[PDB]
Structure 1
Amino acid sequence: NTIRVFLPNKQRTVVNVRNGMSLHDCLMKALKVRGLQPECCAVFRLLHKKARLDWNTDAASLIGEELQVDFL
């Protein structure tokens, strides 16, 4: 149960989704470690025209998706 996330500055991560975490909570560590914070970024679901997402979207609802996080 993971989500592939493309990150600013040509970085990327795959995160494990534990039960009951929002996207904010789910990506906090991967962003913190790279000197970013969710506050000044937007997150998008990439389709199969990307869809902008609220950071409070539940991470378990995006299992198997690909996301982009980008500076605002």
Structure 2
Amino acid sequence: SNTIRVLLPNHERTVVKVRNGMSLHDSLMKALKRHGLQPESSAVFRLDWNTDAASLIGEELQVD
């Protein structure tokens, strides 16, 4: 699947689509600002922002 589900604080969540060789920060940067969160103040729970997006297909991660 090309779909990845992400959980957010305050019982929020979002689902973003990824491509072949996409950065974690660059693939969901629009969804973070849409919900109202900056990636600098965000914290993925854990992984790094340089992680490939397609490499995390099929898993759920939380942001704080």
TM norm structure 1: 0.79
Structure 1 moving runs of 4+ over 2 Å: none
1:39 aligns with 40
2:20 aligns with 19
User: How many aligned positions are there?
Assistant: 63
1:59 partnered with 2:53: yes
**Inter-partner Cα distance in structure 2 for 1:15 and 1:63:** 11
Q: Which is richer in strand?
A: 1
RMSD: 1.0
Any unmatched runs of 5+ in structure 1? Answer: 45-51
Q: What SS does the corresponding residue of 1:43 show, helix, strand or coil?
A: coil
Q: Could you tell me which amino acid in structure 1 is paired with residue 57 of structure 2? A: I
Any unmatched runs of 5+ in structure 2? Answer: none
**Inter-partner Cα distance in structure 2 for 1:8 and 1:30:** 13
